[PDB]
From a paper:
Stn forms a tetramer consisting of functional heterotrimeric StnABC complexes. Our findings demonstrate that the StnAB subunits assume the structural and functional role of a bifurcating module, homologous to the HydBC core of the electron-bifurcating HydABC complex. Moreover, StnC contains a NuoG-like domain and a GltD-like NADPH binding domain that resembles the NfnB subunit of the NfnAB complex.
The StnABCS2 structure demonstrated the full occupancy of FMN-NAD+ in all StnB subunits of the tetrameric assembly. In our cryo-EM structure of the StnABCS2 state, we find full occupancy of FMN with a bound NAD+ nucleotide. The NAD+ forms a stacking interaction with FMN, placing the aromatic rings at a distance of 4 Å from each other, which allows a complete two-electron reduction of NAD+. Astonishingly, in the StnABCS2 state with FMN-NAD+ bound, the lysine coordination largely disappeared and instead a strong new density could be observed between Cys114 and acid-labile sulphur of the C7. In our structure the residue C114 could potentially coordinate C7; despite the distance between them being too large (3.5 Å) for direct coordination, we have identified a strong connecting cryo-EM density in the StnABCS2 state of the enzyme. In line with this notion and our data, the 3.5 Å long density between C114 and one of the acid-labile sulphurs of C7 found in the StnABCS2 state may represent a hydrogen species, e.g., a proton abstracted from K170 or Y117. Notably, in the stable reduced state of NADH/B2(red)/A1(red) observed in the StnABCS2 state, electron transfer to reduce Fd is hindered due to the long distance between the B2/A1 and B3/B4 clusters.
Residue numbers in the entry:
A (entry chain A): 18 to 167
B (entry chain C): 1 to 118
C (entry chain B): 1 to 584
D (entry chain L): 822 to 938
E (entry chain C): 587 to 704
Write the structure that this text describes.
Amino acid sequence: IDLTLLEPVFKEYAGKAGSIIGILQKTQEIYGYLPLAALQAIADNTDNKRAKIYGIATFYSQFRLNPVGKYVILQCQGTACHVLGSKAIGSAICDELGITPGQTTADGLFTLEDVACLGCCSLAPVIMINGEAYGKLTPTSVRKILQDIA
Amino acid sequence: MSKISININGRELVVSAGQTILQAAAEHGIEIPHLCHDERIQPYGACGLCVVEVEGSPKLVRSCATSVQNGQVIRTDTSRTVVARKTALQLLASDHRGDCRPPCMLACPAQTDCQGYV
Amino acid sequence: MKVRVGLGSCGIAAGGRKVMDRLAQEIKNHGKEIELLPTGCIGMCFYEPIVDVFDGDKVYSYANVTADMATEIFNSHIIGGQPLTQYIVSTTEKPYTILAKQVRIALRNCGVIDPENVDEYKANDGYKALSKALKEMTPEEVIEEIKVAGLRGRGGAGFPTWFKWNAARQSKGEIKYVVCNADEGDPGAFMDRSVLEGDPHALLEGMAICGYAIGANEGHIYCRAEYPLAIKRLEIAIADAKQRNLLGKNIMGTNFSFDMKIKKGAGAFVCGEETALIASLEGERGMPRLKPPFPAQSGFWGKPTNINNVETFANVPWIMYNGGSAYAAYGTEKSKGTKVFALAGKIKNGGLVEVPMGMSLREVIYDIGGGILNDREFKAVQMGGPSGGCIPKQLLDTPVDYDSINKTGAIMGSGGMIVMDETTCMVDMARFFLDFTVKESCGKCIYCRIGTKRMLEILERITTGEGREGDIEELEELSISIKDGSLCGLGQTAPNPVLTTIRYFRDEYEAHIRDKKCPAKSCKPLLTYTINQDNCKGCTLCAQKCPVQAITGEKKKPHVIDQALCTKCGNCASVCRLDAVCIE
Amino acid sequence: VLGYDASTNSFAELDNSDFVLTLGKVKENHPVLDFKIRLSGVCSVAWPQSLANTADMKVFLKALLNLGVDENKVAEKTEGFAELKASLADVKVSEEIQALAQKYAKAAKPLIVIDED
Amino acid sequence: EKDSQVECHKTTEFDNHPFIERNPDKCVLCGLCVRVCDEVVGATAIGLVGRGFDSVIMPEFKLPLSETACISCGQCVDVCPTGACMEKQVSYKQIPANMDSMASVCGYCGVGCNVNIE
Ligand SMILES: NC(=O)c1ccc[n+]([C@@H]2O[C@H](COP(=O)([O-])OP(=O)(O)OC[C@H]3O[C@@H](n4cnc5c(N)ncnc54)[C@H](O)[C@@H]3O)[C@@H](O)[C@H]2O)c1
Ligand SMILES: Cc1cc2nc3c(=O)[nH]c(=O)nc-3n(C[C@H](O)[C@H](O)[C@H](O)COP(=O)(O)O)c2cc1C
Ligand code: SF4
Ligand code: SF4
Ligand code: SF4
Ligand code: SF4
Ligand code: SF4
Ligand code: SF4
Ligand code: SF4
Ligand code: FES
Ligand code: FES
Ligand SMILES: [Zn+2]
């Protein structure tokens, strides 16, 4: 664990009231998730009532408590993509990759997550992979794309 | 001063400013259901069982979170409040696992408390 | 020569950086002095990535451009002066027909100015309203001009500003706060991200103006962290405004000081509501509190606070500059201003549309959107997202306003257009919208905690084929009670999709329940498959594309579908060229 | 008319009214009631002595009806309101009757104290 | 009565605290326990975890209650309206009964808190 370089984050954000969310976002940007040791380190040296830290980290719709792969898949699950049939794309992803949403692949290369909306609703369905968006998508297209990446 | 007086459920009562309607009704023997109310801490508004109808308000108000004023008319046993409380209790009973009374007592025809004297 | 590229978030969903760096390489090799400017989307997110070319006083747009297409553009048109007529869809003499009916007010800088440069905003009549309000008008004059302008509130709500905005100004306290609720938790509605990435200087000017008017010196932006490009552009604009004495202390010599801070939210849909957002800003769990007390009497840390959308703060300076008397002519009587919508779904010309109110929905769907994608039959339009309602095929004549949309059971909300044709199951759409509110409820009050899950269980049981008699009655009984008793605004307008699709599409619920079949035939387990023996001749195209082999038959003879083995995936009819696969 | 030959409100509610209309000689017959009304401080208007005829009260009813009452609620809650409206068709309204009716209909929570003697 | 087609959360809880028993199956999520432990006691040994149906009240970092900052005061027990929080048995075998109550004062501290012995 990289706690030595986690020390500057709460060494700089200290003294700001209501700074639990910012500390948690920086910790997740560093580690890719929120390990229990990092939460314990945040609870120490900044008090902030450890139970409240855990409740904040759990709520907030987005904070990963588990490690992720090198390429993070974010499937746009908005209204426009669901109208055009993103369920079939999700089924194709689950069939080809053998994983369920919220989990990680065995080789640690792909991680499936469902987001509310990516916002590029004109090119529905959309899939985000490490900030690269693929729009106007079909299951054959996503299978070819994931084969080309891997 | 001037004797702050409210009118709840048909009766006229003399109360003190700063108190909630829940406390004021309970001081005069009027029962309003509540689950999430403690008079020594702040209001929460989770259960919603303390809803009453107050004249001048379009929607039901939570008597655990509204302080008494002068000359306000309150009803606690209307159709709307009873419907809301029954729906809330049905939703709560939709999630509860437990034995209120043991099997031995419920099998007795006279419902003697077998667990108690055993 | 001027080249504009609408490279933004939707551009990343297209060629995006490819056309930009290819054009940069081409101009680097040629060595010409041509100004390449990254802009935001015009609003036509289809046909992206948009490229605008300036020849003299003429502007051409012939986009859908890749790296090879950009190279051909540079070789043929940028140097040779020859347009490619096979890609031309908009010229100066022939502009976009879609923008012909659009009174562009909120997007008057999108696709025109450089968002990362304050100079382009200043050259496009920007920040002049700021100087006018600072030097020539009093804050009371600002409030009265807003009042004659007819502004009451944007982003749902509806209560008038003068009872909340002027009330926030009149609120006692040495410290007042301004919050711009720049989180757009609505799926499919992306007006705030588009404004932030296309013209953040207008929003910064607007927030400065309302801060000057209400007497607040410090303000916050509640912006989600999945909005980086927007955060980077906003911080660049903030740095530029600090550098050019447009922000900070003593702007244009005037005594009023205004400083900016950017707060990145964690991204929860319930973290709006003006009481959960306060708790999020306060560093706690976003859970709605009890109203009353209102944030006008106790908001940020117990201090009075004014919270408004980006739309309101954008509209305020543009009212300030010209005058609210001009905007009283546009639209209906009861509500004034302009509306910003995002058209999506089974539509042809989808994307962001700027409109006035009073304009009929059939105009928006057909005349502006080009009709229905694949020329299908229009069925319904959804307004407000998961918290909104549905409008059927019989009410396209309803004008867009607060009162008319409130009449038909829907909610304005963020103002999102979803177009659904006859191939969308309505019960599945209600189930989807209710699943979104189930996944985004804070679970404090018991109605939104339990009842909205009970309705979801009913809907998922209907959309499988295990529904019973009376499920409509249980749905109505749950919906009215959840709407009445929920503490937060999320659970109050939670059953609006079910309540609007149960009175406008009640005949399909019975079809899913009694007949156990799906009228739209897009509702998986409620189907059956048959082969027409007359209109198909044994090419085995469907049986080859069913990798379980539940369809048996010889060559040049009609096949037989085994019902006990096929799982009704839907690929038995997607490839049949003779269309003899009947679905019942 | 109402079902019970009794007053519909208590004396304890005299302090929260914003208008008290006195009919009869309450001061001379029940003077402690006048003590309470005076100490409460609410606005009290006595029925004029020059209106000792029931036709003046009918003019009062007509002036109240012309001030915009809800006809549908009183139609569904009463019997014989249509004939009451018909019998007040050609009733003229005077100035003092109009002033009294305006005072009564303007106030949110009025009481009428009638001396039975 | 319960319908089998709806789901109630069943727990396999293992919290062998010597004094405080917590049953999430009987919780109505009124939040009185966390509010008292935060605002009154100040230990903040318990808190909310999750959203919606998945909201559950549990100690810090899902640790046992004996591994956290608990005082074992029992105020969470005293404010609970249901059987989700109960205190442990002082007698040889405790039972549900209507106990007789006598008012006395505590015999340990000079603060002299008033008690009801049941
Ligand atoms: N983007 C959007 O606009 C959007 C998104 C989702 C939901 N909604 C809508 O939000 C609405 C609910 O709004 P809400 O949850 O903020 O509560 P609300 O509508 O009851 O409150 C309306 C506004 O009036 C203010 N107000 C009321 N009385 C006041 C007083 N005496 N003094 C000062 N201010 C006062 C409130 O603070 C609030 O700003 C719903 O109609 C829902 O559809 C809107
Ligand atoms: C679930 C939910 C989400 C909301 N999201 C927003 C939002 O994103 N932006 C916004 O301005 N208001 C939002 N609101 C409504 C706010 O309460 C409202 O903006 C605020 O009370 C005052 O808005 P006004 O400036 O139009 O009066 C939301 C309300 C709810 C219940
Ligand atoms: S099982 Fe126990 S906690 Fe639940 S209702 Fe019955 S007595 Fe109360
Ligand atoms: S209505 Fe839903 S989101 Fe709002 S406070 Fe209640 S449970 Fe939370
Ligand atoms: S429907 Fe498909 S599988 Fe059946 S006979 Fe025709 S081509 Fe062959
Ligand atoms: S229903 Fe789909 S998966 Fe099943 S046999 Fe037919 S084509 Fe294959
Ligand atoms: S006090 Fe009891 S019922 Fe209330 S939330 Fe805590 S454990 Fe649940
Ligand atoms: S016993 Fe006291 S300190 Fe321990 S959890 Fe309960 S209230 Fe908190
Ligand atoms: S008197 Fe002392 S030991 Fe007894 S309950 Fe009070 S504080 Fe605790
Ligand atoms: S609806 Fe899919 S990206 Fe926005
Ligand atoms: S007692 Fe629970 S809402 Fe008031
Ligand atoms: Zn269906």
